[PDB]
Structures are given as C-alpha cells and as structure tokens.
C-alpha cells in the first residue's frame, strides 16, 4: 500500500528528465547533439557546464529524494528500497511521460546509492572522475564507476536486496551504454578531448 | 463499420465481470458486489489482484487498439472506452447487474495516458491511505484523472469521454456517498490499511 505508493512517486518522479525540459525552454533539440542522449553529459554538450551540473544535480535528486523516503520508512534492508531505486532509474530511462525515451539513468543511480551510502557514492564519483580524466570518454567512466559502486556495496557487507537493486540498475546502465560501447571499439565514440572542452 | 465493431466488442469484452467468473473458479459466491474489493474480500488479495488486472485488461485492451488503429483523436476511442466501462457496469451476461468500473476506467486511461493514469493511481492510494474509504478515493481519483487529462492538453474527444465515464463512475456510487456522508460507509483500521 504505501510501498506502491512511494515505488509509482519514484517512477514519475524519475520520469521527469530535467535535460530534456531545460533544453526544451532553451530551444535546443538533444536529439541532434552528440550521443542524442537527454542526460548531463550531452546537456553539457549542447548547452555548456553550467547546465550540465543543474541537470546532474536534478537528475541526481529524484533517485535520491524516494531512495532516502525508503531507507527511513521501511529499512535499508527492505525490498521497497529496492524497487524504488529501480523505479526512479527506470523513469529516467523510460520516461512516460516523454513517450518512454530517456537517459541511461547514471545521475539518478548516483543519487539512489547516495541515498543508501554517501561512502560507496563519493567513492564510485571518485572512481568516475580518474577513468573520466584518465581517458576522457564519460560513458567509460559511467561503466566502470557503475561496476565499482556494486563491488563496494558487496565488500561494504551490504544486504541482498540492496545488492539485487545495484546489480539491476547496473546491468541496465550498461545496457543503455550499448551504443556507446558500440562507438567505444569502433573508435568513434564522443570524446571529450582537447578541442571539444577548448571549443 | 470496423469502428462499430470495435465498440461493440468492447462492450461484450467489458461485459466479462471477473470477479464473478474467478469467484466461481475457486467456488466462492459480503457486500455482494463483483468488484477486485469484493473479491480480496472473499478469496484474499491475491486473487483480488487478479481481478483487477483483468477488469483492468478489458478497458484497457480495446482502447489501445482504438488509439494505434484511430488514434487518440478519434471518437472511436470515446465509444470504445465508454463501451468497456458500460459493459462492466450493465454486462449483459448477468443481467446488466454490474460493478463501479474503477478498474476498468484506469485501464482506458492508461491506454490513453500512462502518466494521467499513474497519477490519478497516485491520487487513489493517498486518499486511501489518508481517510482509509475505498470509495472517497476512488471518487477523489475519478475527478483528479479528468483534471489531469484536461490540464495536460488533452483532445476534446478524450475530455468528453472522461466527463461521462467519470459521471457514471461517481453515480454508480451514489450509495457510497450517501452512507460517506450518514457515516455508515466501512472503514479500514488505522493498522489495517498499513498491512492491505
Ligand atoms: C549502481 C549505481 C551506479 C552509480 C553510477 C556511477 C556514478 C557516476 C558518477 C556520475 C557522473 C555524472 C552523471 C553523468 C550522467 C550521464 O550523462 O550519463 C551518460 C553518460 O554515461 C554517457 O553520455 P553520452 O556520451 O551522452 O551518451
């Protein structure tokens, strides 16, 4: 009963890609912009790092806004968390309201982990931030920060339903990278190299 | 032609009372009523789920067929989506003796607008969970779809078919609203609408 309720809230709230309307009242069509995506990455592209990080920021909160309203109703080892973390990235991913076309929900994912631990979320950004300056592709970094946040909820003793939700939400942020990986070994993949943040 | 078909189809379709024929299933005959409530009810949640996934199919199954083969503009999906619903409320295999529709409303919305249709799900389980009435939610749901579906921007052929789908659905519970109002309307437990 109030599970549903907050598993549905995190749904539609997860629904609501901020790139997508933010881009929308700037007038620019994602669609064409670099990877097409609606996500923080390629609302950096089209828009610059001032709208990217609001995107990330907001994205970020409606995974983290219904992870948290799970962990303190129900208990960080109940399955309600579960759903509703996987509810807020599937929202993102398959917005209904934008007729099931979003993002690959890592911003929406950090916040959920964010909700469940600060520790394994500033630890898995950390693990984004190197592999991202390391090679400069996002969705390289995205991958491998998203396969460390689930071997650091494992070590960190985390109960099984905590761990079927990060392996879920993970099997479907690299699912949703499969046209990155595609780009990635074709050598095509959207850098973000010397002339792309210079220009 | 393939449009009358369609509306006629929906209507025997919704004529399917569910409750009823899973009822008779396991061999079960309180309120009386053939409704998903009604069977939790009887037969426990599990089929009462059950019942609503199937009153919620028979909506929802030939409306979507009227928005991709008509689209969401077309009057054919207005007399199919009222089709459904009359058909579960006067189903002619049980002698037009029916239920209140709710289910089978949310599956003609959620044909037309998954998101106005999750909402006014939203809408029903705090008005549930809040005042602990089934019927007070699902007339506060009923309205707050409409209002959905008009502020989203929705065509005229859907407005029309939510105003009179709506009105039957909040007539078919004039009882509940005079025993809401008489206080003679059941009522969950505090405790008990946490454990439903
Ligand atoms: C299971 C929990 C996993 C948590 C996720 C890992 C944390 C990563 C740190 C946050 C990075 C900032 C947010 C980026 C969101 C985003 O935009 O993702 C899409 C990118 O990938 C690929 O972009 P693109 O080239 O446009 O397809």
Same mark, same amino acid.
């Given at each position: 009963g109030s599970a549903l309720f907050l598993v !549905? #809230? /995190?749904?539609?709230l997860g629904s609501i %890609?901020?790139?997508? *309307? $933010? &881009?929308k009242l700037k007038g620019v069509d994602l669609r064409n912009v670099g990877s097409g995506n609606v996500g923080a990455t390629n609302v950096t592209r089209a828009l610059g790092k001032k709208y990217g990080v609001l995107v990330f920021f907001l994205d970020?909160?409606?995974? @983290? !806004?219904?992870?948290?309203?799970a962990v303190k109703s129900f208990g960080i080892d109940s399955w309600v968390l579960t759903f509703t973390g996987l509810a807020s990235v599937l929202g993102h991913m398959y917005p209904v309201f934008f007729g099931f076309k979003g993002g690959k929900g890592v911003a929406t994912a950090l916040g959920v982990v964010f909700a469940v631990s600060p520790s394994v979320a500033l630890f898995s950004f950390l693990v984004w931030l190197g592999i991202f300056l390391w090679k400069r592709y996002v969705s390289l970094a995205s $991958?491998?920060?998203t396969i460390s /946040? #689930?071997? @650091?909820? @494992? *070590? /960190?003793?985390y109960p099984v339903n905590v761990? @079927?939700? &990060?392996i879920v939400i993970g099997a479907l942020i690299i699912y949703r990278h499969r046209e990155?990986?595609?780009?990635?070994? %074709?050598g095509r993949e959207h850098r973000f190299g010397t002339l792309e943040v210079l220009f």
């Open positions: !549905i #809230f /995190a749904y539609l %890609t901020f790139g997508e *309307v $933010i &881009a970020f909160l409606k995974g @983290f !806004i219904p992870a948290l309203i $991958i491998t920060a /946040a #689930f071997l @650091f909820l @494992f *070590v /960190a003793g761990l @079927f939700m &990060a990155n990986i595609n780009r990635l070994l %074709t």
